[PDB]
């Protein structure tokens, strides 16, 4: 059904803004990207850069993934990102999130032919 690449774009890509729109960004986006459907996803990161710039990270600095696989890549540039972190007050089905914008290096896992991002590992 949903490709791994498509799932990455739905969960992690938001090129349509340059930063976190507002303090309510994570509440709206976690909902609209269907990450509060079956439970409140506790944490999530959105990347504000172009799809082409995020796809280009698959050719950048190869680093170990947190799960010990070898197919993770760190961006040479900093990127505009928004971190979403579920609050203590959050109870499913009204998932509640603190929005934090940052400019950080991203780490993504890449797979497939073509070789594309499928997982957001970390920011640094």
Swiss-Prot record:
Q: How does it assemble?
A: Interacts with and forms tight 1:1 complexes with RNH1. Dimerization of two such complexes may occur. Interaction with RNH1 inhibits this protein. Monomer.
Does the entry annotate any disulfide bonds, and if so which pairs? 26-84, 40-95, 58-110, 65-72
Q: Which residues are glycosylated?
A: 1, 7, 34, 37, 41
- Give any GO molecular function from the UniProt entry: lyase activity
Query: Active site annotated at which positions?
Result: 12, 119
What the protein does comes down to: Endonuclease that catalyzes the cleavage of RNA on the 3' side of pyrimidine nucleotides. Acts on single-stranded and double-stranded RNA.
Q: In which tissues is it expressed?
A: Pancreas.
Annotated effect of mutating residue 12 to A: Loss of activity
Q: What is the name listed in the Swiss-Prot or TrEMBL entry for this protein?
A: Ribonuclease pancreatic
- Keywords per UniProt: Disulfide bond, Endonuclease, Glycation, Glycoprotein, Hydrolase, Lyase, Nuclease, Secreted, Signal
The organism's place on the tree of life at top rank:
Eukaryota
* Biological processes, Gene Ontology terms: defense response to Gram-positive bacterium
Lineage, please? Eukaryota, Metazoa, Chordata, Craniata, Vertebrata
Report the EC code(s) recorded for this entry: 4.6.1.18
Q: What is its main location?
A: secreted
Family per UniProt?
Answer: Belongs to the pancreatic ribonuclease family.
Per UniProt, the enzyme's principal EC class comes to lyase
Its encoding gene is what? RNASE1
Give me the reactions it catalyses: an [RNA] containing cytidine + H2O = an [RNA]-3'-cytidine-3'-phosphate + a 5'-hydroxy-ribonucleotide-3'-[RNA]; an [RNA] containing uridine + H2O = an [RNA]-3'-uridine-3'-phosphate + a 5'-hydroxy-ribonucleotide-3'-[RNA]
Annotated substrate binding sites: 7, 10, 41-45, 66, 85
Q: Which organism is it from?
A: Bos taurus
A cellular component annotation (GO) from this entry: extracellular region
Query: Any idea where this protein resides?
Result: Secreted
């Amino acid at each position: 059904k949903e490709t791994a690449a498509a799932k990455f774009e739905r969960q992690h890509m938001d090129s349509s803004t340059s930063a976190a729109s507002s303090s309510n960004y994570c509440n709206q986006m976690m909902k609209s990207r269907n990450l509060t459907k079956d439970r409140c996803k506790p944490v999530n990161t959105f990347v504000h850069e172009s799809l082409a710039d995020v796809q280009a990270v698959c050719s950048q600095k190869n680093v170990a993934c947190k799960n010990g696989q070898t197919n993770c890549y760190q961006s040479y540039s900093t990127m505009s990102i928004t971190d979403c972190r579920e609050t203590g007050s959050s109870k499913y089905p009204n998932c509640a999130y603190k929005t934090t914008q940052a400019n950080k290096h991203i780490i993504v896992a890449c797979e497939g032919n073509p070789y594309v991002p499928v997982h957001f590992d970390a920011s640094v």
